[PDB]
Write a protein that binds this ligand. Sequence first.
Ligand code: UYQ
Ligand code: UYQ
Ligand code: UYQ
Ligand code: NAG
Ligand code: CA
Ligand code: CA
Ligand code: CA
Ligand code: CL
Ligand code: NA
Ligand code: NA
Length: 466
Amino acid sequence: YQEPTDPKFPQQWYLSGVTQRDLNVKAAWAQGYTGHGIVVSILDDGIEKNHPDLAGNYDPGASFDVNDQDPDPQPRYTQMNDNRHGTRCAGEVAAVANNGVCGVGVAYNARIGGVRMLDGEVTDAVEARSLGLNPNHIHIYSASWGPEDDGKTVDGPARLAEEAFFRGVSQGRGGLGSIFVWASGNGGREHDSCNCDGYTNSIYTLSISSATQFGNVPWYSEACSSTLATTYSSGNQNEKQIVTTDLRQKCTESHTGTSASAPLAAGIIALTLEANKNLTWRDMQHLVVQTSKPAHLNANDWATNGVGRKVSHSYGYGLLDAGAMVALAQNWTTVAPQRKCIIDILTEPKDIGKRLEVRKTVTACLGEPNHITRLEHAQARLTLSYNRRGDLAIHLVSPMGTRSTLLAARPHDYSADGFNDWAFMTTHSWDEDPSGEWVLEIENTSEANNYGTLTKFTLVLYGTAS
Ligand SMILES: NC(=[NH2+])N/N=C/c1ccc(/C=N/NC(N)=[NH2+])cc1
Ligand SMILES: NC(=[NH2+])N/N=C/c1ccc(/C=N/NC(N)=[NH2+])cc1
Ligand SMILES: NC(=[NH2+])N/N=C/c1ccc(/C=N/NC(N)=[NH2+])cc1
Ligand SMILES: *[C@@H]1O[C@H](CO)[C@@H](O)[C@H](O)[C@H]1NC(C)=O
Ligand SMILES: [Ca+2]
Ligand SMILES: [Ca+2]
Ligand SMILES: [Ca+2]
Ligand SMILES: [Cl-]
Ligand code: NA
Ligand code: NA
């Protein structure tokens, strides 16, 4: 193996660095993993399939134009270059290497496609037809859309899109499951809290946040318990940004935001799948939990969970480590089939008022086929009314003492509509034994005399017993 010679590879500090502030991708390349045989699709505004740094890896079988209903995802060219984003993301994954053009993709021998689906009216059907594209050919999907990042919206996939996620992880990729890599949001300036985004809050998406070059939480980041891990992206004007392919056969040094982090993650996951093509969608999440690195990411909420891992709501388990991912993948034993233990908690509705605490001791389906002693995701599915939704903060504590923030106060969320069986999800108790006392806390963070009622609390545990 030889270091890439592309002219901008030295500017790709998150790959080419030698000061330990990078994604450890050279180490994976040196192990012989470059993405050969893997297929990634960018679900966004299209892909410039004739870009000199994309054409060599472009895959029509990974591509479609859902907005205009044709096979050709070429972007719509406009004076402001509005439809450049999918091309930028595609190059992050699989820009061609050693060709004298721009830089390289993380998985520079993977095949890359795009679905043109954001440049038009984005319905449930449009979303579902994109998530469900060619699921026995495409291995990995990358996406960074969802409800508006205005800090007041609560929404997620409607019926067709939710069905596409369950079909993807169940029958996709030959029954191993489509890998849906997702950005956790760009609503940081609005104080958004990303479990309110049902796409990133899903267990079926492998959710990724950002870190700046100097190791800080960027202005645009959203914190939430559903995030799994982090990749580098942009920050302040003294910090470098993401360097990649751009619309009109150009090269940019100013790709930004959490939308630039998810494609880097998708590239690392492509190297990992090359190392073990038999990994399931759940295996891949386990590998991310075990190998990601907190070191040198700055956050005031790093906490040690019940199995000794550090976790943050800004960063999940930390920075992805490509060399560690591919190394651990090679001899990985497939996890056991996924169990689901449903615990309906309340015997009566509970007044919220200023503060409500609900304690429940559970056996986690002891004696049943769905008995779980090794947790993966957990959800607190809550139904409640409240007069001003954004004044609520919600926490969930596992029996091992791990305090997951399910919802932070959102100052712009004036909604009086509450939560309707909203499945707040945490990854922070992964591999814990969920038997014992769980604690739900709901608090009014305002000095206002707010009021409401909790009418349903379902604890849903996913995982295994081995
Ligand atoms: N939860 C969220 N992730 N929300 N995402 C919101 C959102 C809003 C606008 C656009 C525009 N994209 N325009 C393009 N790609 N040319 C993309 C995403
Ligand atoms: N269930 C949901 N709320 N899905 N939301 C999907 C979604 C939301 C905003 C946008 C904006 N795009 N803006 C642009 N293309 N200029 C695209 C997709
Ligand atoms: N803004 C929204 N409208 N969100 N709605 C989301 C949502 C998600 C799944 C389903 C499934 N329904 N399945 C059935 N009815 N058998 C229904 C609604
Ligand atoms: C993939 O994993 C399954 C489950 O462990 C196993 O039965 C199968 O033999 C594996 N296939 C390959 C090609 O390793
Ligand atoms: Ca077209
Ligand atoms: Ca190149
Ligand atoms: Ca958001
Ligand atoms: Cl389920
Ligand atoms: Na997710
Ligand atoms: Na702890």
